[PDB]
Design a protein around this ligand. Structure first.
Ligand code: 4AJ
Ligand code: 4AJ
Lengths: 115, 116, 116, 115
């Protein structure tokens, strides 16, 4: 597992559970091709998206479906989704965690890249 | 006035100056049409992107070119850009400020929405 | 002018209005002496806390009364307050903006420091 | 372990390792009494601060020594420390994670409170 997504809820102080997450890889023609997807677990985490063999250098987009998450909690949100776009680089550490902290009108995101 | 972008640098403790920003609007065919663009000033603010007439209802994407910002400063950052995607003006005209706070491996973004 | 506090609400997408703020300065005996206080306006800003003369070098604590804010809105938040502690004016006078973005279980804070 | 502290580095995209963390409990006379302390691990985490028996309701302060952290990396920071002040409440979930994401002139903090 070289890619992991962690989502937190700043309103309830909890993991953000059952959030849909879609990962795309940028194609040669600049379009976004589907790469991996899933829903966050009870811990707010989504493991098992890809493998080392599949996760080659390139530009990836992680789309977190925040709007559906907030609406399922009965809350009106601002964003359609949260988007995290980055280059995977073999020169740096091998494990990427993309973390996001969600509020209705705001989000924060960070990358934790380790070996 | 109807749309304003403010960025800030969390490393320097300063406005993020000269940050390029591209705004897109989702067209009827579901592509992202270029809507407006500009650069942040010495105050980290970008005014004058659009007008009340042209800023109709729709789904908008504000792309803040964070990589270009950090690379112009000689720093190798993580993200390509920060993208802020939202429906606007669906209950009539509002004024939107999209703010972002940048670090090399992280960013925060918020919206301030006001009704004139 | 030398010290300004801006808060924002990440739930509402608005300025955080009527937020109480207490500033302290570390005294020679290492206690926190009251320095100034005030409330954010309808814009989420708090101006007029101090003067260039009185805002001397020192270690300052800006306490933003987030619990009182959320409880006045009928919400039970996690934190008591947000505390921002920093050395100021140690290389001569600067202008400081302390900003905070509030959620019930979280907050972000940043500083914008400028040299007049 | 009912209390855990996690610290991340937004400049390097990493755990914040070897950060000193002090926890205080508010006494009856409104002073802060030392409660627990330690240094974050290689994963940016500090476990083992307290036990269920010791961690009674009350107001706690977690002080994260961000200034020393940044200076040890050769970076000039703004804050003296980051401070997280909260009430432990038995009515809510039993496990508290206090997370902080550090930059030189900024920090973010959240609480993840679960059962
Ligand atoms: O709508 C406005 C207008 C002028 C200033 C600001 C602003 N100042 N600081 C922020 C700010 C602060 C933190 Cl701590 C954040 O995490 C984010 Cl996203 C924005 O936004 C926001
Ligand atoms: O409880 C955990 C366990 C593992 C990782 C995290 C975590 N990772 N990132 C954060 C995080 C991210 C952002 Cl954008 C934030 O503003 C904050 Cl305060 C924490 O928290 C939090």
């Amino acid at each position: 597992c070289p890619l992991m997504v962690k989502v937190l809820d700043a309103v309830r102080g909890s993991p953000a559970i059952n959030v849909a997450v879609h990962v795309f890889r940028k194609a040669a023609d600049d379009t976004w091709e589907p790469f991996a997807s899933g829903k966050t677990s009870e811990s707010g985490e989504l493991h098992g998206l890809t493998t080392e063999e599949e996760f080659v250098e390139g530009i990836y987009k992680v789309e977190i479906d925040t709007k559906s998450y907030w609406k399922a909690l009965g809350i009106s949100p601002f964003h359609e989704h949260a988007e995290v776009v980055f280059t995977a680089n073999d020169s740096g550490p091998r494990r990427y965690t993309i973390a996001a902290l969600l509020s209705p009108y705001s989000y924060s995101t960070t990358a934790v890249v380790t070996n």
